[PDB]
Amino acid sequence: ILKKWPWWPWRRK
Numbered sequence: 001i002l003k004k005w006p007w008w009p010w011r012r013k
Contacts, residue, residue: 006012
């Protein structure tokens with residue numbers, strides 16, 4: 001689940 005280009009500059013792991 002969850003797999004659509006990880007391009008989030010908010011809470012990157």
